[PDB]
Amino acid sequence: NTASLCRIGQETVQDIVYRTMEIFQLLRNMQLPNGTYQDRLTKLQDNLRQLSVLFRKLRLVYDKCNENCGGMDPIPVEQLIPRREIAEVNKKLKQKNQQLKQIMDQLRNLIWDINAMLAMRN
Amino acid sequence: VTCVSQMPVAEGKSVQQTVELLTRKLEMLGAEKQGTFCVDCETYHLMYVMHNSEYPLSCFALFENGPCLIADTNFDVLMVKLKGAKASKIETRGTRYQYCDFLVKVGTVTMGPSARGISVEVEYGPCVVASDCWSLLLEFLQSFLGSHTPGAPAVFGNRHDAVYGPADTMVQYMELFNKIRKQQ
Amino acid sequence: LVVPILEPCGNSECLHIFVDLHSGMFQLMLYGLDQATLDDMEKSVNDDMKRIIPWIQQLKFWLGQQRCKQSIKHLPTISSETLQLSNYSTHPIGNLS
Amino acid sequence: GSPHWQTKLEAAQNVLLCKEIFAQLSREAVQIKSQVPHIVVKNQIISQPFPSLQLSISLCHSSEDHLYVLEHNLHLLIREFHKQTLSSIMMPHPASAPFGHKRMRLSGPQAFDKNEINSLQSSEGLLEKIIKQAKHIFLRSRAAATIDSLASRIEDPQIQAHWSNINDVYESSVKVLITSQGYEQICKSIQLQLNIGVEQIRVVHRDGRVITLSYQEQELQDFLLSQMSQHQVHAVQQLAKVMGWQVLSFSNHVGLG
């Protein structure tokens, strides 16, 4: 779950940035009643809460990832390069996908057909 | 947003050869030539009734500075059965060229046997009230005719607020025909 | 009696000569021969032939032009057949033609 | 369990209707001389649209489903012909000139027609129309097949597709967006809008281009592959912006010869 930690933290940073984006967005829309709307303040608060959540989350994931679980890491250079169960799940997935595509094709044909008719005389 | 104008002989060459010069220029610009056109007019008593090839199911009757109703082709017959004419007819006839969304007609106006002049008709197909589009028409004609000149005729229609049908075209036609009969 | 017009053949574009089983008069399709030149070639081939040769010689050029235009489509281009250049007298444009 | 007499009456009526349709079609065969040729034998009207395609319109007097749409449409077409004969559109609103098409009036006073507008009223036959549709269905089938087959054989830049929900008898439309496997939101150029029509596929590209692909399939294969390459090279720039890098950027077209 280590690489899982890496990816999830990565996504948490995007979540940070996007939350900040929407927070400033909500702030921009604000009105200062002239009204008694007050729902604005509600969204602002409960929005600001998630940011607080994600920061502690980032601290936790950072700690767990730089924990360095017995790793004598080589510097990136020389990494740029100038299990059967995976195969089984991949095969099952590809089969299920193919069946889904038969279904999608059938529905496409039905929709083309129903369209042809009705649009012809309805 | 039709525009009509009378291009002099500039003789120079003969009136047919003037038409030939215009044809050659307009073919040079890169415009395909479509089926011929023909507009003709008659005056009664004063009433003007005129036919056009762009509208071969409708014949337009116009009083100068008055009403201008369009009618069905069977309005000639009503004028026939109404004898209660002068044989001053006029009849333009020539080929129809087509530019990109842009139609331009040149003709040799004829009264009796003697062609009195050369009349050119340009109509930018997709258009609305001319007051907004006349810029583009001038932009084009300055290349084709502008040598002599085009001179804004849609002022015959630019006074209004906003409308344009096909009648004002034949109104301009009648104005030109009244101009070509008078002077030699 | 499809008839190819260019060496590396594309069945999609080559030429199709058809004979209407009810009338005998020939029927031609070429996928976009301007629909007027197709009519001209129609009347020719129907009259006598003896005439497929010159029209094949012209269709060769047409198909070349369309292949070039289609290739150049992707890029920025305004392809055309003729330019209105003054200097045709001595500059080599007169040579290649 | 409607009365037995009604079953025989309706069967006979349908038999007469399909006889009438096939008669009309066989007439149009020896008639207007469609651009594609067509054989009529006695009860099978074989024709070729786009070559390698043989459309057979038959009459199975006793005593597919692609063309099932085509059949049910043909039926409505002939009944539209009949209705055109006797309809209110023919009826004159003013107690006046004869039974014109309610538009041939407006073809009068309202100076209406040039060659094109007047010609818009003339008819286009019955076999020509159905031939059109048949072609359209086929074309559409070929495009869907080649796009999905392209999707099957790559697994690098994914070719997502979304057909429309209003497919008219003449012309259909679809959107194709090619995206990178994970980065979608972030990166999205290379988007198209095919207009599949009878005998031509018009492509409108997000960048602003308008290419008119032919009715073949190799052409669409090639165009979509060109877009796939361009998309990889665009996705790298989008990613460099996504965060972290300055670009000494590309030529969409050229590279460096």
Added chain:
Amino acid sequence: STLVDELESSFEACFASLVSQDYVNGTDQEEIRTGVDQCIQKFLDIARQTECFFLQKRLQLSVQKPEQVIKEDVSELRNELQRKDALVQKHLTKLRHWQQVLEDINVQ
């Protein structure tokens, strides 16, 4: 102040520019523009850097621990399988519904 402390500090600045506590005196748009520009650029840049750090760690984990990445794949695949049969089953329920409806309208 490894990296995450830097991001927290940057976010803190990017907001607290305005909020702080004090009398405001005219706001003279230009200084607001310059402040927001600098703060927001540093924020996005520390975001840059944290993303770079995580990605580098993933590359290391790949070149070292491939059992980890292959298990990541098996996890994502099985999750997609579940999502897929869920979608098809929902659509099957919808098909049953509309089937009964259409054939009913036929019966009536």
Added chain:
Amino acid sequence: RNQQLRTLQEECDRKLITLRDEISIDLYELEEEYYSSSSS
């Protein structure tokens, strides 16, 4: 009977249009679905 059969036709067309609508929404969900990495 003309009015009766017309009402029946209108009912059938309405049902069919709502059907083509609901199935179209489902097909859009699938358009999203059958286009996602088939790497395995």
